[PDB]
Ligand binder design. Structure first.
Ligand SMILES: C[C@@H](CCC(=O)NCCS(=O)(=O)O)[C@H]1CC[C@H]2[C@@H]3[C@H](O)C[C@H]4C[C@@H](O)CC[C@]4(C)[C@H]3C[C@H](O)[C@]12C
Ligand SMILES: C[C@@H](CCC(=O)NCCS(=O)(=O)O)[C@H]1CC[C@H]2[C@@H]3[C@H](O)C[C@H]4C[C@@H](O)CC[C@]4(C)[C@H]3C[C@H](O)[C@]12C
Lengths: 200, 200
């Protein structure tokens, strides 16, 4: 179908963009580099891919959606659902995702944009709030028959993700600190889940 | 004294460096810009100020020391010392420090260095571990007559600072999200202190 060829073309451009970002580097790579190796698979006209930044964020679109459904699945595998084991299932999947080299590579690209005057990032984050994983946790907190947990649901979701992610991701990104292996992941999630549920 | 003039000279160069960073911008500013308006108050020779990055991190040296002693004082004002009120005194001072425009401006400079091949940042962080504020909390946790708190002291210190700082600072820095006013600060610290001490 024409629509399928359209989508196949978009995917070729994104893969080319990503490959350049990884080999040549995000800052080194220009739009014309991407048009160049996309060939005539990109005709300058019909695109919403109007820039290097726009393409990066189209790639991020997909990755966010992919991570969301993966975390959601792992979490909804548990039907029984104590808060402790839902936290723990969310935690394990979330932290694993942040301990891949990819998470660091993308992290660096985003950090490097701190002085961008086009505000692609702010627009992206504001237009995609519903696609972030913390929403998954937020939904469970609501379901909890607890005054405190329903009313603070979003902030608790965000608190939990933060305790898991930081400052480890920040250090992976800024000074390329070592990732956590599987065991350390497990340990950190459990450590965090206890403090969160039961306090020190 | 010669030693006092030496120090006065160093301070002039740092103030010039900082002023440029704030008005012209960190990336826009070059070492020669700094030498330029430092005048002959900088003779190229005796300095350890061998670069724009080195100067930035000399400025950061002072700021870190200043924040450390300020938090330490506010914390040691309390002699009575329940864990709750020591956490709360550390929290209020810490979060206030991160909700100043300065914290954001410096944050952006650091983030922008993510692709620096000189690794000034990693060296700086590794050489100044003892000067970070989390050490203050770490010391209290040790003093607590608690097996769990003494053995995890550093990680608990780092956990607490993180729950306070993130992801708010990250968003101030990346997309210039609004700072918390005094009331929101107070609210967040208390919110966080409860979860930390007592769990949800
Ligand atoms: C800026 C970070 C803050 C997280 C967030 O957006 N929380 C919202 C809090 S709030 O209720 O609106 O206050 C997140 C948001 C989007 C994140 C990035 C997108 O997630 C990019 C991905 C790649 C993925 O595997 C997820 C991690 C990551 C490599 C992210 C790193 C980064 O620190 C970002 C920018
Ligand atoms: C990278 C951040 C992580 C904090 C940290 O170093 N924790 C150590 C954890 S661990 O036990 O070694 O694992 C911190 C460390 C030094 C921090 C920067 C220095 O603090 C620069 C200052 C300016 C000050 O007012 C403090 C905040 C800040 C504007 C910082 C922002 C930033 O996110 C940094 C880089």
């Amino acid at each position: 179908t024409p629509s399928q060829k359209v989508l196949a073309r978009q995917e070729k451009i994104k893969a080319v963009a990503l490959e350049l970002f990884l080999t040549k580097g995000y800052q080194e790579t220009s739009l014309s580099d991407i048009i160049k190796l996309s060939g005539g698979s990109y005709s300058n006209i019909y695109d919403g891919f109007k820039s290097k930044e726009g393409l990066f964020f189209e790639i991020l679109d997909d990755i966010c959606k992919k991570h969301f459904h993966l975390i959601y699945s792992k979490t909804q595998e548990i039907k029984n659902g104590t808060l402790k084991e839902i936290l723990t299932s969310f935690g394990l999947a979330f932290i694993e995702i942040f301990n891949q080299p990819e998470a660091v590579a993308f992290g660096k690209i985003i950090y490097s944009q701190v002085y961008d005057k086009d505000r692609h990032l702010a627009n992206w984050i504001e237009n995609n709030q519903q696609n972030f994983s913390y929403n998954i946790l937020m939904g469970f907190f609501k379901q909890q028959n607890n005054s405190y947990m329903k009313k603070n649901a979003e902030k608790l979701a965000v608190l939990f993700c933060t305790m898991l992610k930081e400052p480890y991701h920040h250090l992976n990104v800024l000074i390329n600190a070592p990732l956590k292996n599987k065991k350390e992941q497990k340990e950190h999630v459990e450590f965090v889940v206890n403090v969160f549920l039961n306090g020190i």
